[PDB]
Ligand binder design. Structure first.
Ligand SMILES: Cc1cc2nc3c(=O)[nH]c(=O)nc-3n(C[C@H](O)[C@H](O)[C@H](O)COP(=O)(O)OP(=O)(O)OC[C@H]3O[C@@H](n4cnc5c(N)ncnc54)[C@H](O)[C@@H]3O)c2cc1C
Ligand SMILES: Cc1cc2nc3c(=O)[nH]c(=O)nc-3n(C[C@H](O)[C@H](O)[C@H](O)COP(=O)(O)OP(=O)(O)OC[C@H]3O[C@@H](n4cnc5c(N)ncnc54)[C@H](O)[C@@H]3O)c2cc1C
Lengths: 240, 239
């Protein structure tokens, strides 16, 4: 399982706030396609957080919630509903929603993938496909049109690496064990010639992706760019 | 300044064939948005095809060509139109369309990018965004539903590396020169601290992508799986 650190504590709570803010959109939805997409995303999110039958109750409650409530009244009704369904664990501790709420959710999902793979095969390959669906369908909820447009262009970078893992798991299914390496360069050296996978690959993929977004935004605003996060420091922050 | 080689000449003729097939879709288009997108993409492809006003006349000819022609009849009218506009260069020598026509176009575009960068400016930084738009908007044209769905999932891998190039040219605009290195590993090791950029990045990037797609399709077909190596690829193209 994932190591308990302060930073991982915020991730889990950002993940719950994010999940809460996503289901609040269900009552507002203006299309059947959005409703099906929000319903499945939130179901999938909680399934990575019987718990599953209670979650179906929560999700169904949110689909039929009044569309004329504001957000704070939805929060009141949600707090009660999760308490009643014995899902206090779904309840966020902090309701301040920002970019760090989205980043934490993506970094959380990355750590979850690394844990499922190191601690693992049909099951892990079905989870990895649900993860691709989650990353493909990240919503910002907050207002940032240009963030949405940027993310739709490059989200495949993350998603591509999930497929490398599936490719690696497919080789283990067929005879070649996965070999775990400590640096991205070794994994990338291997593919150009045997089944090497970086340990904590997705933590590093999403970290590298975080930096690239933040590097690119200076082009966006047209200003000269300053502490960037390093894999060394990140691993220390998360006890990896 | 792309090295003229056998594989590259096929890339070039595949590029032209892909472009001819795209503008053939303009007469059929069922939405004003798809019309907007195909004519932009075709204009862009031609603009990179290793005069612009003549291309605009070609495109405008395609927009108004009869929707009740079949494709072969369109090919007849296109071969005449390009002959009249003094654009015999846009004419493909082979009209057999396959997955290799699409791959060849993608690998062609990758080689254009690496050539603009090492022979470079706000100019190259602007041409890269157009490159991003082209890769975001690749049409298969042939029938491969699961292909389009796979490519829409992972196309960002390619596009991300175009952004790393803009990021690198932005640091050069503001002081730090690009340092060209020989492996992908040296570029990804130095991002983690300085402005290194792999030489022939997009050739390597779209080469690795091509392998990934082909490895992934054994998962897609549920089947127990000769892959292209960088050294072999650089040999084939004289990089
Ligand atoms: C998918 C996504 C796309 C975005 N696209 C854009 C855009 O196009 N234009 C724009 O202006 N903004 C964009 N943003 C927001 C942007 O990335 C920043 O969050 C914001 O612009 C300024 O945030 P910041 O530097 O103050 O903190 P942030 O960059 O948000 O980081 C906050 C926290 O995350 C942790 N952290 C910081 N860096 C890393 C890292 N490399 N790896 C792991 N953890 C880290 C740290 O704990 C830090 O406390 C996007 C955000 C997301 C989640
Ligand atoms: C964007 C895109 C997405 C696709 N998604 C799918 C999918 O999801 N499922 C599916 O079944 N098919 C998919 N395809 C088609 C698939 O990749 C193959 O083209 C097809 O299966 C034919 O396989 P092949 O090995 O015979 O030839 P190809 O893989 O098409 O190779 C043909 C030519 O390309 C050259 N070549 C081969 N490998 C490389 C390489 N790594 N780098 C550079 N050049 C190379 C060689 O010169 C060879 O002659 C996709 C194609 C594209 C262009």
């Amino acid at each position: 399982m994932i190591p308990l650190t302060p930073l991982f504590s915020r991730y889990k709570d950002s993940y719950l706030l994010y999940s809460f803010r996503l289901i609040d959109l269900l009552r507002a939805s203006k299309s059947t396609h959005l409703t099906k997409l929000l319903s499945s995303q939130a179901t999938y999110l909680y399934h990575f957080a019987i718990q599953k039958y209670e979650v179906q109750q929560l999700i169904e409650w949110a689909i039929n919630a009044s569309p004329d409530m504001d957000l704070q009244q939805f929060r009141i009704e949600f707090m009660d509903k999760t308490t009643e369904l014995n899902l206090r664990s779904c309840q966020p501790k902090s309701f301040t929603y920002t970019f760090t709420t989205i980043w934490d959710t993506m970094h959380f999902l990355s750590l979850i993938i690394d844990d499922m793979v190191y601690t693992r095969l049909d099951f892990v390959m079905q989870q990895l496909k649900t993860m691709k669906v989650l990353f493909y369908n990240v919503f910002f909820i907050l207002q940032c049109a240009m963030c949405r447009d940027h993310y739709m262009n490059v989200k495949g970078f993350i998603i591509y690496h999930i497929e490398l893992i599936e490719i690696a798991l497919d080789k283990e299914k067929y005879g070649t064990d996965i070999t775990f390496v400590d640096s991205y360069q070794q994994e990338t050296a291997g593919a150009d010639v045997n089944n090497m996978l970086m340990k904590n690959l997705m933590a590093y993929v999403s970290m590298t992706f975080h930096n690239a977004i933040n590097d690119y935004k200076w082009i966006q605003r047209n200003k000269k760019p300053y502490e960037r996060m390093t894999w060394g420091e990140y691993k220390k922050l998360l006890n990896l």
